[PDB]
Every structure is written in C-alpha cells, then in structure tokens.
C-alpha cells in the first residue's frame, strides 16, 4: 500500500520508546500497567493486523430551547484474534466520526485476555483458565470454559467480541436485560478482562519482576525538547 504515512509525533514517553523500537509488545505496558493515552501506541504495537468491527449505530436525542436534537452512537470492538481486544462506544454528529472515534476509543481500552485449557492442556490454550463474570448496569455475562469444538456459545454480539479476543471455545450464561446491547457487550468485556485478575495456583509464585522500560529508557524518553 501507498498513501503517505502520517507523522505521528508522540506526546508520551511511553510512545517514544515504542516508535524507537524500544518498546516492542503491549505486554510491557500491561505488566507495568502503564496507562496509554496516545492511540498510535496501540496502533504501532498491535492493531497492525488488528481488525475493528462496528457493533451498533442506534441514534438517541435531548431537548433544545427551540425544540429538538438528534445524533449517532456507534459501538466498536477491536481485537486481533489472539489475546487482545478493546471496546468503544461513541456518539457524534456524523456516522463516520462516530465510528472513527469509536475505533480510537476501543484501541485505548485494549485489554489482555488470559486463555486457558478446559483441562487437558495439549496444543495450546483453547478456552479459559477459569470462569469469569462481569456486570454492567444489570446485565451480567458469565464465561465458562468448555471442551474443544464447543466453540463460542453466546449471542451473536457477544460471540463477535469473544471471537476477536481469540477465544476458541467458551460457554456463556447471561442474566439481566440482555436487549440493551451497550450493556451486554460491556459486561462481557469486563468478564474477559477479569481473566488476568484471576489468581490461579500457577501464578502463586513471585519475582524480581521488572524495572520498567520507562526507567531504563528514561533518557530515551526525554528527547531533546521540552
């Protein structure tokens, strides 16, 4: 392809390390729990070859002095196929912007997924380590590990998110007003994200850990400006 790459320039030290080829995977950020504020960071480290699917469009409105207003809300999900996903909702004047912003929002939110084995761990993880549930304003989604070939047993919208996350097989049960899509996807998003939070016995032991690329790269991440 040839369209003339932009000229991203970074606000953030985390960003400088990334462009410099100093940070190479999101994992570094995730382990450090560095916050990510520049969307390009996500874009350079992953996202390249990460596909975004727009989930919904539904319009809303609120009342003006001289009567009405109405605008477009877009729900976007992003993820490779393996282990990374994000979710973003935006409402804007125009569909394109609503989608364009939503994608940006989704990327900022990208989250780790811990994918595991239903039980006999051969040939790499097909499902989830444990069972994790997430709730958003009365909708709650529960993910359950399942045997191979089970696949994603969820509603179409949820299947799509789980798919991008890179889950092969998982059982789901959903309670609450499933109809209100923004809520259902949000809860499932919380559910998947919760997998990293689960502490299993595998995790029980600790570690010099890390010094943080921010510290080692520190000079590197104070360029020659101010």
């Amino acid at each position: 392809g040839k369209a003339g790459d932009k000229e991203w320039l970074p606000v953030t030290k985390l960003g400088r390390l990334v462009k410099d080829m100093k940070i190479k995977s999101l994992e570094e950020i995730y382990l450090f729990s560095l916050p990510i504020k520049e969307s390009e960071i996500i874009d350079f480290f992953l996202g390249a070859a990460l596909k975004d699917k727009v989930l919904k469009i539904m319009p809303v409105q609120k009342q003006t002095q001289a009567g009405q207003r109405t605008r477009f809300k877009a729900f976007v999900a992003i993820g490779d196929y393996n282990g990374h996903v994000g979710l973003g909702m935006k409402c804007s004047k125009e569909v394109a912007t609503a989608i364009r912003g939503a994608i940006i929002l989704a990327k900022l939110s990208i989250v780790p997924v811990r994918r595991g084995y239903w039980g006999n761990k051969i040939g790499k993880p097909h499902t989830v380590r444990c069972k994790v549930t997430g709730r958003c304003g009365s909708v709650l989604v529960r993910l359950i590990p399942a045997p191979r070939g089970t696949g994603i047993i969820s509603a179409p919208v949820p299947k799509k998110l789980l798919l991008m996350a890179g889950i092969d097989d998982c059982y789901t049960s959903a309670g609450g007003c499933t109809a209100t899509l923004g809520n259902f996807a949000k809860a499932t998003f919380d559910a998947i994200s919760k997998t990293y939070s689960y502490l299993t016995p595998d995790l029980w032991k600790e570690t010099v850990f890390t010094k943080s690329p921010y510290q080692e790269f520190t000079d590197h991440l104070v360029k020659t400006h101010t």
Partner: protein, 82 residues
C-alpha cells in the same frame, strides 16, 4: 502456564502486590511501586541498587501504600523501631 511439553504459554506473568500478594492486573493505573536506593553502607553514596516494592491500587485506595512500605522497608531494612 505450562503446555504439553513443559513449554511456557500464554503471554505474560503479572507482578504481585508487595502487601497483599494479589495480581496487579493490567490496566489498573491507580497503582505503582517504589524503588528505594541501596546505600554503599557506611552511609550516603546512593549506590543503585534498588530495594523495591510494588503496592496494589486496592491497598493505596484504602489508605495504606505507606505503611505497607514500612513493614516492607524495615523487615528488609533500612527502617528500625518504626
């Protein structure tokens, strides 16, 4: 996170709180650790060589990170009769 042939799979092993032994997970940016300098004994002379602790969002929001550091710093020095 082993696989079939003792191989290490998925993608990362998170750091664990220095106070509660609970996963820092991964987007909770209301949490940070704290590198304490080692001293070339005797006194002064910051010499590296960090003595380091990581504290969870939880402990910190509950109005600990500090003490936790002290149980942490004294138990392994410096800090005495705290």
């Amino acid at each position: 996170m082993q696989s079939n042939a003792g191989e290490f799979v998925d993608l990362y092993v998170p750091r664990k709180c220095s106070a509660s032994n609970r996963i820092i997970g991964a987007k909770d940016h209301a949490s940070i650790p704290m590198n304490v300098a080692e001293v070339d004994k005797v006194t002064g002379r910051f010499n590296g060589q960090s003595k380091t602790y990581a504290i969870c969002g939880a402990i910190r929001r509950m109005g600990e990170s500090d003490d936790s550091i002290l149980r942490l710093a004294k138990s392994h020095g410096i800090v005495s009769q705290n």
